[PDB]
C-alpha cells in the first residue's frame, strides 16, 4: 500500500 | 482486580489530599491550636510518605497472588487505614524546626521525581491516544477523524501561543527580568524543535504512529510548567489557579496510571513508591530561587525525555 509522510504520521488511508 | 486495587489506593490518596487541603482553611486553625495549617499539612504529608514507603517496601518483589502479601494488597483495608491514622498521630509527636526544613528538602526531591514519572506517563498517554485515533481515522470516514485531529492540535497550539503572549505581557519587561525572557525563549525553542523533530521522515519511518497532536500536548504542558515556575517566585516585582491545575493534572495522571497467581501484572512496590512520590509532590504543591531551578530542570528533563522517546529506537 501507498503510505506517506503526513502530519498525523505514517498511514495510507488518504491513498488506499 | 489489579485496576480495582490501584483505583482504591488512588482514591484513598486523594481523600488524604483533600483532608490536608481542608486543614489549611482558616476555619480549622482554632481547632488545631487546641493541641498552623502549613504545619498540619506537613505532618499529614509526612505520615502519607512514611506509610506509603513502608507498604512499598513490604510489597517488594511480589511474585504471585497466592502469597499472602498479594492477598493483603487486595484487602485488609481496615488495617491500612488503621496504620494510616496511627502514623498520622505519631507525625505530630516529632519536634519541628530543622526537621521541618529536612522534610522540605525531601519533598522537593520527591516532587521532582514525581514530575519526572508523571511526564513519562503523559508521553505514553499521548502516544496511545494518537495511535488509536489515527487507526480509527484509517478505518472509518477519514475526513471526519482528520478534521477532528487537525482542530484539536491547532487549538492546543493556539492556547500555547496565547499563553506565551500573556507571559510576554506580564512576566517580562525590556528594562529587566532578563532571566524570565531567557526561560521563555529557551522553552519556546526547545518545544519548537520538539514539534519539528516529529516530522523527520526517518523518525516516522521508525515511529509510524508519531504525530503533531502529542507534540502539541507536550508543548502546552511545558508552557504551563513555565507559568507555574515564575508563579512561585517570591519577588512580586518579578512575579493559586496554577496549583489547582497542577492538582488536576495530578488526578488525571494518577487515574490513567491506575488504568496474578503466575505473575504480577505490574510492580506493586513501584506502584506504592509512585504513590509516595505523589504524596510528596502534593505537599510541595500546597506550598525562592531553588524552587524555580527545580521547575526549570523539570521542563528541561521533560523535553529531553520527549526527544529520547522520539529518537532512541532509531539508535
Residue numbers in the entry:
A (entry chain L): 102 to 117
B (entry chain A): 34 to 68, 93 to 296, 334 to 353, 397 to 424, 439 to 466
Which text from the study accompanies this structure?
The host proteins SERINC3 and SERINC5 are HIV-1 restriction factors that reduce infectivity when incorporated into the viral envelope. The HIV-1 accessory protein Nef abrogates incorporation of SERINCs via binding to intracellular loop 4 (ICL4). Here, we determine cryoEM maps of full-length human SERINC3 and an ICL4 deletion construct, which reveal that hSERINC3 is comprised of two α-helical bundles connected by a ~ 40-residue, highly tilted, “crossmember” helix. Thus, we conclude that hSERINC3 is a non-ATP-dependent, nonspecific lipid transporter for PC, PE, and PS.
Göttlinger and colleagues presented evidence that the ability of Nef to downregulate hSERINC5 involves ICL44, which contains an acidic cluster motif (EDTEE) that is a proposed binding site for the clathrin adapter protein, AP214. For these reasons, we also generated a cryoEM map of the ICL4 deletion mutant (ΔICL4) of hSERINC3. Using the Fab-proximal bundle as a reference, the distal bundle is rotated ~5o in the ΔICL4 map relative to the conformation in WT hSERINC3. H4 is paired with H8, which has an ill-defined density in the full-length WT map attributed to conformational variability (a) and is well-ordered in the ΔICL4 deletion mutant. e TM α-helices in the primary structure colored as in c and d. We infer that the ordering of H8 and the conformational change between the helical bundles in the ΔICL4 mutant suggest that there may be allosteric communication between ICL4 and the transmembrane α-helices. (2) Our comparison of the full-length and ΔICL4-constructs of hSERINC3 shows the rigid-body rotation of the helical domains and bending of the H4 “crossmember” helix. These features are similar to the conformational changes of MurJ in the flipping of Lipid II. In the WT hSERINC3 cryoEM map, H8 is disordered, whereas the rod-like density for H8 is well-defined in ΔICL4-hSERINC3. Similarly, H8 has lower confidence scores in the hSERINC5 AlphaFold models, and there is a large difference in the conformation of H8 in the top two models. These observations suggest that H8 dynamics are integral to SERINC conformational changes and support a role for ICL4 in the regulation of these structural states. a–d Superposition of full-length, WT hSERINC3 (gold) and ΔICL4-hSERINC3 cryoEM models (blue) shows a rotation of the helical bundles around H8. e–h The top two AlphaFold models of hSERINC5 also reveal conformational states similar to those of the hSERINC3 cryoEM structures.
